[PDB]
């Protein structure tokens, strides 16, 4: 049981371990505060979120859960890891306060912007890779977009969630609910990603959910029978079908002088239908990344236990699994 140290700062009471130094805030937002601090420990730099009224609600309270779970359990050199979480609480009964602990990133993928076809395959391999882990374990991202890739100065990169419009890179089975999804809703957002990188133009910028499915329906074509056919909806299939019929477009003719490989891996992401979409585990394979897959260092998670999910609790069943956890946390070796 450590020294905590109070101090105030962008109107907060912040509570840590000395432990934690020299503590700087970086962005506040509805969700929580975040503050850059060096770690006497390990001589590293740090980041530490401080949750926002973690336990007012039931949805709070099971968000604040989820969050804490995940993070305990990501495990892998291109998704965010937990080093630390903390709580000021002495008891149970007085525990109100979340702080959480990772390692400090930099510059985002929206800052760091065209750049040279050897960095696009390098940065998506490394989401590719990041996304296999994630997948395996049944979780899905579903917001991937530039700004929650972290990107340091060696061009690694890591996944994570800070919580550029969302609709610019979302899957259209997802954004209008027409037909049933899986995980590569995340893969059709690395095609929106690669081809921005691959041309310095957002691929898709809709003002609304009709202008968006209209921008993309311009590139891969309306809806053929056979996917027609899968459609559950019968307003969705109405609209479609009462749309002007689109051709689907010759991707050469559109990322005109990318190198032709890249051409063939972004038609396999940004297909329609979500059951021939390419996994993550198959782009890895593909013949862009040639120079950077070795399949005996592209690891799988561990099962994943999400049955609470389904759970409905009152806000101090949610509260007390959170403080659990808190208390079984083991850190990572140095
Ligand atoms: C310099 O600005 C920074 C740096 C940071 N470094 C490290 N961490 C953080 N933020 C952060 C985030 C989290 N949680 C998650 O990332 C999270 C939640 C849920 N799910 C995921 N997954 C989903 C599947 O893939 C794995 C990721 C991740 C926990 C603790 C911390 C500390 C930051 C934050 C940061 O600045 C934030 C505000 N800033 C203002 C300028 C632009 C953004």
């Not at 530039?146 to 890591?158: G, I, M, T, W």
């Not at 059951?275 to 990344?289: C, G, P």
Request: hydrophobic share 40%.
């Amino acid at each position: 049981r450590p020294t905590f140290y109070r101090q105030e700062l962008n109107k907060t009471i912040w509570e840590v371990p000395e432990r934690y130094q020299n503590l700087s805030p970086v962005g506040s937002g509805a969700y929580g505060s975040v503050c850059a601090a060096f770690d006497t420990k390990t001589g590293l730099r740090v980041a530490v979120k401080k949750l926002s009224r973690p336990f007012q609600s039931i949805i709070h309270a099971k968000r604040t859960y989820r969050e804490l779970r995940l993070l305990k359990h990501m495990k892998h050199e291109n998704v965010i890891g937990l080093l630390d979480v903390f709580t000021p609480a002495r008891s149970l009964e007085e525990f109100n306060d979340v702080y959480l602990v990772t390692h400090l990133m930099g510059a985002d993928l929206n800052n760091i912007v065209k750049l040279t076809d050897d960095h696009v395959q390098f940065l998506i391999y490394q989401i590719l890779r990041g996304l296999k882990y994630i997948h395996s374990a049944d979780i899905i991202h579903r917001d991937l977009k530039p700004s929650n890739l972290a990107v340091n100065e060696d061009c690694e990169l890591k996944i994570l969630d800070f919580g550029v419009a969302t609709r610019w890179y979302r899957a259209p089975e997802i954004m209008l609910n027409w037909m049933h999804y899986n995980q590569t809703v995340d893969i059709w957002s690395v095609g929106c990603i690669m081809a921005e990188l691959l041309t310095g133009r957002t691929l898709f910028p809709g003002t609304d959910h009709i202008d968006q499915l209209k921008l993309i329906l311009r590139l891969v074509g309306t809806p053929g029978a056979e996917l027609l056919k899968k459609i559950s909806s019968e307003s969705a299939r109405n609209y479609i079908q009462s749309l002007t019929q689109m051709p689907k477009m010759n991707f050469a003719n559109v990322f005109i002088g990318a190198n032709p490989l890249a051409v063939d891996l972004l038609e396999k992401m940004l297909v329609l239908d979500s059951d021939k979409r390419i996994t993550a585990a198959q782009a890895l394979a593909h013949a862009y990344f040639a120079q950077y897959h070795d399949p005996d260092d592209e690891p799988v998670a561990d099962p994943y236990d999400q049955s609470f999910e389904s759970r409905d609790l009152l806000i101090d069943e949610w509260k007390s699994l959170t403080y659990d956890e808190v208390i079984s946390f083991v850190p990572p070796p140095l």
